[PDB]
Design the sequence.
């Protein structure tokens, strides 16, 4: 017991006072080193968690909380933290707890002034408490903390509400929490799956209500660009589309939800947007389509979808920078009639670069004679490896001046593409019918 | 990885999409049983103007057998029997079958489809 609880309380009072100068990372490393002693760790953490619960004269610390309001952090009359200061005391305590997760106090505090896995339950209850539930920052920090610690029913309901209600990094840490909890017990796996499904069904029902208003207002717009106000609650960053897609991506991550009333009206809505002669107007349903192809096309109905909306799914993919074979729409790699040429060209070029991404490519010389380029290139390259061919060739013509290497390479490709069809090599001959095409010369055995 | 392209699209990937002067093609079109002011022909030209560059190129391959644009223009469009202009023929068979091509004559047989939408759908389904 290197330090007593009064010296620890004096150190912990530093978490309440918000001073920018104070080195709180150094204070965190002091508390971390002190917390190697298990009884000290246990008292420190039980105090920090009592500070969170109490967030939800020497001790005269005036924090500027709002305009014209300089609050006292402590109200002592049984010691309470003034709710204006509370969110900062929470933020500093969660900052300390994140380090302790990488690795009585009140009565002592008034005595001065007068002169991992178990408390995970408290930290999951903390999500219900208003100063935290308000603050996206405190929620993100608490979720990072839970994502570290994870390495019951209400506590999972409160963890899922973090996804069904409003932090992309904090909700990816929430995904980590929900996974690592499900790794724990088959019963928590099952209960979190079924409560995810419950939330996704709520989201689907209200999404079908919203798209039903959208479709109805598109009916009333046409029957007489698209800036339908019903669109605002789909464009919104916190739209049920993004919540539904997030929840489905977590469901599919836990797998290793019957809504045909949604899917068929997403159908007729997309069809009525496409018939309404506007194009990006579809994109307010892109995440609902991505949900469709998540829930369907399990690692069919999605194929009839890609047929009846073919040009729509193409508008989606062409607009999306999501790489076709890394996004959800990868399944249709093999059903290729449902994509545009330039979409397939991008997929081609990205998958080619992905397969050869491990290869460092160098520059590579090709020394040729202007009068012999074809045979000099054959000699130079025909024994080269494919990966040496994949190097960028720059061509040097003997004694010629320097010139733009790109234009000189383009010229080189042009001359070669000619010489392919010089009859002296007997490689290609014109179709006797067309007379402008070329096919293998069956007389190349000469 | 190449098998994702069509037999048209591999050509369009290797040699690129040509820029088609539809005015040059129209100037070098021969109409045999259709006429230049037939409604199905105005629908044909409207469709071909409405098609993007890849479907236009796929059409050119369908009717000429290639995506290659003649340097001198379509007046110099070759066929099996010397310079042959592009040509549209009315297909007097039933109008529930696609147009058909005889690329050595640069010949299109085109049923008298009853509407712009159906003609566009059938041509796009052919290409």
Sequence:
């Amino acid at each position: 017991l290197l330090l007593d609880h009064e010296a620890l309380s004096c150190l912990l009072v530093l978490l309440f006072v918000d001073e920018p100068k104070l080195n709180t990372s150094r204070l965190h490393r002091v508390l971390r080193n002190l917390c190697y002693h298990a009884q000290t760790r246990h008292w420190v953490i039980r105090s920090l968690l009592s500070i969170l619960q109490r967030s939800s004269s020497w001790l005269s610390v005036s924090m500027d909380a709002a305009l014209g309001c300089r609050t006292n952090i402590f109200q002592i009359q049984t010691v309470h933290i003034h709710p204006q200061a509370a969110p900062v005391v929470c933020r500093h305590v969660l900052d300390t707890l994140i380090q302790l997760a990488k690795v009585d106090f009140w009565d002592l505090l008034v005595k001065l002034d007068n002169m991992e896995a178990s408390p995970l339950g408290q930290l999951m209850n903390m999500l219900s408490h208003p100063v935290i539930r308000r603050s996206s920052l405190l929620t993100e920090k608490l979720l990072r903390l839970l994502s570290l610690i994870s390495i019951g029913l209400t506590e999972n309901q409160l963890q899922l509400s973090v996804e069904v209600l409003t932090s992309e990094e904090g909700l990816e840490d929430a995904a980590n929490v929900l996974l690592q909890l499900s790794r724990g017990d088959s019963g928590t796996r099952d209960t979190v799956l079924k409560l995810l499904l419950n939330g996704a069904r709520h989201l689907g029902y209200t999404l079908c209500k919203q798209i039903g208003t959208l479709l109805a207002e598109l009916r009333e717009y046409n029957l007489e660009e698209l800036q339908l106000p019903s669109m605002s609650m789909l464009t919104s960053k916190t739209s049920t589309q993004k919540f539904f897609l997030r929840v489905l991506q977590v469901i599919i991550q836990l797998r290793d939800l019957s809504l045909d009333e949604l899917w068929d009206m997403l159908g007729e809505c997309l069809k009525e947007l496409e018939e309404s002669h506007d194009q990006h107007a579809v994109l307010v349903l892109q995440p609902a389509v991505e949900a469709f192809f998540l829930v369907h096309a399990t690692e069919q109905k999605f194929l009839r979808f890609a047929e009846t909306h073919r040009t729509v799914l193409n508008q989606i993919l062409r607009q999306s920078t999501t790489h076709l074979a890394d996004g959800p729409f990868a399944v249709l790699v093999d059903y290729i009639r449902v994509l545009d040429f330039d979409v397939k060209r991008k997929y081609f070029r990205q998958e080619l670069e992905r397969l050869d991404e491990g290869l460092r490519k160098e520059d590579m010389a090709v020394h040729v004679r202007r009068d012999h380029v074809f045979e000099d290139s054959y000699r130079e390259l025909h024994r080269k490896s494919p990966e040496e061919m994949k190097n960028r060739l720059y061509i040097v013509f003997e004694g010629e001046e320097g010139q733009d290497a790109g234009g000189l390479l383009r010229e080189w490709y042009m001359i070669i593409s000619r010489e392919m069809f010089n009859p002296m090599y007997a490689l290609f001959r014109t179709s006797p019918g067309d007379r402008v095409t070329y096919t293998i010369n069956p007389s190349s055995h000469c | 990885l190449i098998s994702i392209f069509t037999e048209q699209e591999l050509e369009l990937l290797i040699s690129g999409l040509p820029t088609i002067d539809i005015d040059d093609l129209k100037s070098n079109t021969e109409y045999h049983k259709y006429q230049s002011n037939s409604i199905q022909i105005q629908w044909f030209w409207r469709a071909l103007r409405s098609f993007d560059q890849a479907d236009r190129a796929k059409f050119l391959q369908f009717v000429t057998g290639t995506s290659k644009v003649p340097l001198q223009g379509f007046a110099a469009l070759e066929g099996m029997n010397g310079i042959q202009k592009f040509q549209i023929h009315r297909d007097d068979r039933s109008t529930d079958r696609l147009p058909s091509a005889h690329t050595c004559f640069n010949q299109l047989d085109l049923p008298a489809y009853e509407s712009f939408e159906k003609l566009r759908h059938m041509l796009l389904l052919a290409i």
In short: The longest helix of chain A spans residues 186-222. The beta strands of chain A are 62-66, 69-72, 74-76, 79-81, 363-368, 392-397, 428-429, 439-440. The longest strand of chain A covers residues 363-368.
